[PDB]
């Protein structure tokens, strides 16, 4: 039951983190106006240069929104 | 573009590094709170997130489960 306590505080660091960045995630969206012939591309260098620049857990999970969200542009473009 | 990969991946990195230090004392507290060990951390983290997500279930929670799991495996390892 103590699994739910923890469970909570986890829920509140997911929606806080959840709309934290979720703006930030669409302007670059926006200015990269990504298709699903570039998508791949895009993808793959921008991760390339994020993780040769240094690599940290909150940067995979930067990267993984990020690519979740470039997925549902692409799919509703 | 060309330059503009390095500035996404360079704002990408700047969102990962806020991120990554935003919530690591708060991940810290949560399991010297649970103590896990290396027979308790599959039930622990299990139960953890199957009542996490049936309270409902985004990316930004996706994402903190995750890290939870890592930072309960790095906790079990060194111990
Ligand atoms: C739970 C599974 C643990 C994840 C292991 C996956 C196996 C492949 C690992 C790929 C190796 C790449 C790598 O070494 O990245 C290093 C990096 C270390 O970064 P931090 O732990 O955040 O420490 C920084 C200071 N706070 O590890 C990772 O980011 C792994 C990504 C998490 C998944
Ligand atoms: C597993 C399938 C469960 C599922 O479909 O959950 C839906 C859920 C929808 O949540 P959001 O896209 O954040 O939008 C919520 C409204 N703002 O989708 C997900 O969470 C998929 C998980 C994303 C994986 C992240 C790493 C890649």
């Given at each position: 039951?103590?699994?739910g306590q923890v469970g909570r505080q986890l829920?509140?660091?997911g929606d806080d983190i959840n709309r934290r960045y979720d703006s930030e995630f669409?302007?670059?969206?926006q200015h990269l106006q990504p298709t699903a012939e570039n998508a791949?591309?895009?993808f793959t260098k921008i991760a390339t240069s994020l993780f040769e620049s240094?690599?940290?857990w909150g940067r995979v999970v930067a990267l993984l929104g990020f690519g979740?969200?470039?997925?549902?542009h692409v799919y509703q473009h």
């Amino acid at each position: 039951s103590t699994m739910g306590q923890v469970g909570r505080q986890l829920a509140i660091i997911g929606d806080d983190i959840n709309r934290r960045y979720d703006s930030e995630f669409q302007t670059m969206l926006q200015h990269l106006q990504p298709t699903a012939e570039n998508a791949y591309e895009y993808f793959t260098k921008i991760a390339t240069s994020l993780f040769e620049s240094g690599i940290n857990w909150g940067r995979v999970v930067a990267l993984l929104g990020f690519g979740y969200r470039l997925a549902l542009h692409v799919y509703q473009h």
